[PDB]
Amino acid sequence: XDIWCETNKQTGILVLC
Amino acid sequence: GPGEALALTEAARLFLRQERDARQRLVCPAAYGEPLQAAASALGAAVRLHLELGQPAAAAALCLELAAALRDLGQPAAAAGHFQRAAQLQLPQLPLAALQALGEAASCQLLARDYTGALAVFTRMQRLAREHGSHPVPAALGAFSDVLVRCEVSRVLLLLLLQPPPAKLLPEHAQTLEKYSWEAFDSESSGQLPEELFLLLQSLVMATHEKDTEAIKSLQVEMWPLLTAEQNHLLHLVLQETISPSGQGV
Amino acid sequence: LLTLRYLVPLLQQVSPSAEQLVQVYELTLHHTQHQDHNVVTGALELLQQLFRTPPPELLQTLTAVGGIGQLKPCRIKGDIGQSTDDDSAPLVHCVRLLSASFLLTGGKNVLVPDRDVRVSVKALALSCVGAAVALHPESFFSKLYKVPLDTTEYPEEQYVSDILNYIDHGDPQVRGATAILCGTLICSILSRSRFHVGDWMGTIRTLTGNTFSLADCIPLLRKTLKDESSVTCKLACTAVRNCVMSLCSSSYSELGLQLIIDVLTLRNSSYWLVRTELLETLAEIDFRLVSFLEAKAENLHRGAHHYTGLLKLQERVLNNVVIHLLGDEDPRVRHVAAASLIRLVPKLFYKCDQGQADPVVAVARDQSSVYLKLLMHETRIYRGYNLLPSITDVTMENNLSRVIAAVSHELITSTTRALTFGCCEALCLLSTAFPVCIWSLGWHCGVPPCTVGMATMILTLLSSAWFPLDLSAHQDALILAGNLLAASAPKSLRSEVWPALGDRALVPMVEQLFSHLLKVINICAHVLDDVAPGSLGSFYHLPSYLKLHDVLKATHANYKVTLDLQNSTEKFGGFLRSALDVLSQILELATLQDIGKCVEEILGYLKSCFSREPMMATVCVQQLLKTLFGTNLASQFDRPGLYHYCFMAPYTHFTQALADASLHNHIRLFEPLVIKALKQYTTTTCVQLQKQVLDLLAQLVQLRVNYCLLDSDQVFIGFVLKQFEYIEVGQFRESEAIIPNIFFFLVLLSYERYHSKQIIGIPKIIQLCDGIMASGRKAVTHAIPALQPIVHDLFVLRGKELETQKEVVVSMLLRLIQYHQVLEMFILVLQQCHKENEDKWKRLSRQIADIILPMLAKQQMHIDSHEALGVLNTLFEILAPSSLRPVDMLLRSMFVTPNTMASVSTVQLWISGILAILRVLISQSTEDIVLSRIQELSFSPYLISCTVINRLRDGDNLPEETFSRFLLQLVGILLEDIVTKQLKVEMSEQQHTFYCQELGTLLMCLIHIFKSGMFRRITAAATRLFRSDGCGGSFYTLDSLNLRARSMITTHPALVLLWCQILLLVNHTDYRWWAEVQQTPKGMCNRE
Amino acid sequence: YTARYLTLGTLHYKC
Amino acid sequence: XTRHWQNNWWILYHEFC
Amino acid sequence: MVESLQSVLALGHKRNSGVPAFLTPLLRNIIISLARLPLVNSYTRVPPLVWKLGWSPKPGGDFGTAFPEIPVEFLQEKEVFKEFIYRINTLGWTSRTQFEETWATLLGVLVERTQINVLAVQAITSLVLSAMTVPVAGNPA
């Protein structure tokens, strides 16, 4: 579908800093 | 479950449609109230069910339906009781709904010729409407201001009809009747009332003390367009009692 | 002819010329004479369109006195004139052509046989004559022929007004089109004559000879309201809707009352469209004016049968129609009754109201509050909250209280399912139009010892066995319940459950609503996931919730099989988004100890709801984050009369403004809904979704989420940067809705340093904003929304290179300074320099005044609006006083003519610029500084002489006398442009409004100059100039300004009262004025 | 009947 | 010359008459 | 006016709220007594729904208003028979002849049709009970 699917590479992670 | 209250109120609406068919639609002389005994029983059960569910606002709606049915079926003294039950169930949670129900109780007392009961209910209304609806948080808010105008005019006519002696003449009555005189203040005393109605009510409270019967006749036709039909009935009773008193028997 | 009939609407707004549009019109006139009635039908439908939505160019040519000439059987017996005549406007010929072709024989009281002309062609012709009469009412009073017929066959001449004989034709649509012709004729005569009906009628009676009178129409409307056909009845009350308020405002107000009385019977009609048209008719009526008319009437109260009471129109309209039709069996009629009720609340009048004791005071407030409006300017909580106090109108609170009480009484006493639903719809929409947290006294029931209204009554319905199963009424009840609980917060908050709430009596209500919302959202989650029922949102053990699941399952299954992707009314999606909206609202009152054991459950439900309502689900996710991080409301919470309204309150407010001038680890539960929101943004066209995802990310960056770990390889910023390539080129649709949210997100991304590199940097953000400017797309729509985030950051709350970026941003604002939204940003820049550097504030103030004043002089500022003029007036207070101190720049930017006075926009821009200079002079300089510099600069009063004004309409001594003539000539220009200009034809509704506001502002200046005591030399110059001839007819005489001002009595009484005040301040006490405005012995509300 | 228009000219209609 | 009577407020009493 | 006794002239009904209660019991009694006059009684006995159904005989009598009693076939419709029952209860009867004519019409109906049989049984009950009225044998006024 989406640009991570199209670029075949992963989404990140949610974290505080 | 709570759906039992829906079954009982839909059953009561069927019995009340049967009683309305017999008493109002057909006007049968052979009617004896068996559908109404059934309606009062099913609404009684649904009222108690709503109360054990902790839904007193839903119980009050069923009290209003029975009270309206009793009033429409020619039993106003009975309807006044259930309208007051509804007002009592609503009052801690819906003060303006309680004032609507007390207004229907007072109308029912006037139909039942229960003038001292009507005088007490309107006095309770005027107290509650100042308590819940006449604050800065002082002048009344619009919905309560309409109740205050109704009570004031009706109480003045009921006090002119009944004329209570000392100690029956409450501080609330003495204080209302004090306003309907003039002495020293011209260079706004109308309060919640329209100024034209206030000057005619002032004039009526004075003409009745003077027994000025031709002034009361004059004021009755002038006030006719300004009053409700219930209030025109009250003003007729004041003029009637002035020309020909009750309790004399002859 | 059909293609032209579709094209005509799009060319009212290389361009279509006057000659092209005249050829469309002349083709249309030609083809009405065709042998085929299909072609005649297409030509009359085109002519109907051409009159309902006139092209701007064509409308001028059809109404001008020679505007085209200045640039089977044909049944026309004699000379009707021509399209090319020089002696009268083309609509006079057009109405004669339609009449002679289709409606009239030339013989009095003969209808054209239906053998000769079919009823559909008669109906189209009657419709076209009405649409022409709407633009030019003189057309109706014509003789049918310019030259009489053979006279032996026609012994009396026929007027066009004989078309009203079609009121008793056999066809319902012919009778009804005739009723609508009566309606539009009444409205047009009253509006065109400015309610001077007897003078306008006596003129047209002299020009055409016709004895027809406007009072002859009212019997025809009354007749057709009582028609046996529902079609004719719908058209007759449509004719009343078009003219009733104009009648009430006129010398025929008694006929206005009669039409209001005679429509009230239509509430009983079997046709639902008569009921909705009655509701829409009654929704237009000003009950303040009706209350004035009722108080005046002696015998309208008696009716036909000597009734003994007082008519009571407002009580009957509110209770017996509008609230009565909330119980209507048709949901379409209930919806229109609920919408009509909201329109009525402002218009209601009641005795003893402290804001307005008398209905003439109530109307005088409405007249004054538009035109005597002052020129003014100067962690977010959810939809239904209001922490700060407000200046609510007590009269509006009283009206709202009385309405809410009537609708609540019917809701409590309701015997029938339809009235319960309609009262919940009416209350829900009132809670939107008059929010409970602003109008808390209007909504008060006495319940809290700021308000909660009837909330327990609404929650009792949500707890009923039947009411939840009507999805529309259940939506309305959830929305209403949330609005009633939210409005408690200014009183019931605390500085173990619901620990924030303070007033413990509300916790049962809040817990009841929150538990219910979680159950209905769980039902929607199961319906969308295709799973069967069998933990606060658990419902498998509750009989009422199983019935709700069946209704929602059936509604969604009906949706799965269709492709109506444009439909707003889908009841499952409407229900789901209403439950999510109300959950979002309740979460402002919540705390982590209210939510910390069920946040996992709600996020599970939101994941199911996301693919159906992704936008409103993202709003819930943001509200849950505000509850977790403690940034929500629960966590952050540490007499008058006529002299007053028409003059004294406006004047005290104006003279005060002149004096103030120059004086936790649960965060990892959110990852899948954040990642779905990112993936959705990159796969969608919905700009309202895309706005919400950028708002979510901006919030996650403010909550110190590591953006570099969320957006691995900057894939999302890369995508967002590529959208500008389509936004600049005009290809990205609805991008006006996304730009401010992108720029806000990118300015936050400039501060962060989770990596050792900067992510975006302010140089790029300035370059992207300059790309929106350079690419040539509309500034107010695209470039200005991009600057607003950037300016607020850099000047309020943002290494010395930053000062060069601030100077570049000022270099952006100067390229756009004509737009008032950029003057707002200069007010923010100037105040942030004033607090920090006096010398930089002085340089900027000179840099701005040296640009602004030349542009005012050339009409280059976009200040043709009260909002824009207000923003310019505050900017001149915020500029450093030195920058305006040698008044010769100001005086050279005033004391100009425009390039033309032929267009309304140019006159408005010119006068707006003058009023902006004039206020700076009378506030920030003394009379002697002004008058001494005027005498040295060599201005003259002949700048705007009547001879100069007249050539500018066609195309292109002492200082105290000079200044006073200039202001007195501007009064004459405004009075002519208000009295001597036609609506839609020559000016728009907003232009007519802004002319009146300019005149109200100008007359308030003259009142301050003459009354304050500070401008004595100007008061003497004015007192001399009002008391002279016009210097040989070169200037307006006081007689000519008074002839115009008399003509405004019936239409602008507030402006006329300011003019009366000026006449007293110059001692013009001639009884030829005062005896006529005061009506001395030797009806209309605006006269009173 | 006869009609003159600005943008056409002197057209005739049977009668 | 009418006044209210002390023992009943609805009874009038007379001073100048 | 005889229709208005269900609503506008029913004491304490919502539609009576514009009439002061000193007029309601008077006007009710007057209307019942005017509806019994030979001049108008025959017309008043006819249900208005029967005129909407187009029934149109020639009236006779000394005044020109003496309509016959309604054909039994109309009275087989529920809510035509109820309209008739309301009139025969409200007006009562002016003579023995009118009692026997109204008994004959109720037996002609008596002979979901169980609804008409219940209406007829209730109607006949009300008819025979009306003769138990005491100062005058069949006059509700």
Residue numbers in the entry:
A (entry chain D), E (entry chain C): 2 to 18
B (entry chain B): 83 to 219, 256 to 305, 309 to 371
C (entry chain A): 317 to 329, 349 to 406, 664 to 970, 983 to 1053, 1064 to 1109, 1126 to 1164, 1228 to 1331, 1353 to 1377, ...
D (entry chain E): 2, 4 to 17
F (entry chain A): 2368 to 2478, 2496 to 2525
Publication text:
HTT is a large 3144 amino acid protein organized into N- and C-terminal globular domains of HEAT (huntingtin, elongation factor 3, protein phosphatase 2a, and yeast kinase TOR1) repeats. HTT has been hypothesized to serve as a scaffold for protein-protein and protein-RNA interactions. HTT forms an extensive interaction interface with HAP40 which confers structural stability to HTT. We have identified and characterized macrocyclic peptide binders targeting HTT.
